[PDB]
Amino acid sequence: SKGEELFTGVVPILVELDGDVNGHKFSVSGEGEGDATYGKLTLKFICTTGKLPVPWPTLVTTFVQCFSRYPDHMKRHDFFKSAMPEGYVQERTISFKDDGNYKTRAEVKFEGDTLVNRIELKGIDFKEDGNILGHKLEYNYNSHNVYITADKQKNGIKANFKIRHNIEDGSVQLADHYQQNTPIGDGPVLLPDNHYLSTQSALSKDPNEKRDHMVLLEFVTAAGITH
């Protein structure tokens, strides 16, 4: 794709989110960089409204799959880069098992040479002292597979997957994800064969940062196709 060429080096990233979860209104700003050659993401997020009213891990998937490493032999399946620079809309429903749900709508596109992810998040149906609003989730993150399929009538893709959030009692909080992506621009985009993205993420804290924040290091590789 022409789009793919925009990602052969290190690209700066900005993330901006506004959220409302059970009437708790908040905003997050993130900065960092992506190196799709290595499937690599490094960012730091800050809650600019004070304390984040949900656990940081619950927002990781919402906070740029154009930075996934597509093996050369899978180039023709990379929708995400193909939509650039004009970008794509990304919508999800995230269903926290036996708790509430997030619905997210984001636009991912270049502003100059910077890759931007602007998100609106709405959460409803949460239990006041469930694992989310009760802040019972561990500050860590598991490794997943994101299953992608073409969505031809939308000129885009769908994804489904199961995120597992460890609970502080040793249990697990499932977050079912359903995702739809639609290109914004008029250039050709790639409609992929079925495949998946293999993810891993590490969460940390900046020892000098007293605002509520998250440091994220993530690696993602496309897989599931042999030739």
UniProtKB/Swiss-Prot annotation:
Effect of Q65M: In Citrinine; leads to excitation and emission peaks of 516 and 529 nm, respectively
Coiled-coil portions: none
Organs and tissues of expression: Photocytes.
Result, substituting I167V: In EBFP1.2; shifts the excitation and emission spectra to shorter wavelengths and increases quantum yields compared to BFP
Result for mutant: N145K: Increases fluorescence at warmer temperatures such as 37 degrees Celsius. In Esmerald; leads to brighter fluorescence. In VisGreen; leads to brighter fluorescence
Result for mutant: A202K: Abolishes the tendency to dimerize and leads to monomeric fluorescent proteins
Statement: the UniProt record of this protein carries the keyword Cell membrane: no
Record PTM: Contains a chromophore consisting of modified amino acid residues. Maturation of the chromophore requires nothing other than molecular oxygen.
Keywords: Chromophore, Luminescence, Photoprotein
Matches recorded under InterPro entries: GFP, GFP-related, Green_fluorescent_prot
Effect listed in the UniProt record for changing D151V: In EBFP2.0; shifts the excitation and emission spectra to shorter wavelengths and increases quantum yields compared to BFP
Outcome reported for the amino acid change (mutating Y141A): In Cerulean; leads to improved quantum yield, a higher extinction coefficient and is 2.5-fold brighter than ECFP
Effect of I124V: In EBFP2.0; shifts the excitation and emission spectra to shorter wavelengths and increases quantum yields compared to BFP
A Pfam entry, by short name: GFP
The protein's role, per its UniProt record: Energy-transfer acceptor. Its role is to transduce the blue chemiluminescence of the protein aequorin into green fluorescent light by energy transfer. Fluoresces in vivo upon receiving energy from the Ca(2+)-activated photoprotein aequorin.
Protein name: Green fluorescent protein
Species of the source: Aequorea victoria (Water jellyfish)
Lineage: Eukaryota, Metazoa, Cnidaria, Hydrozoa, Hydroidolina
Gene of this entry: GFP
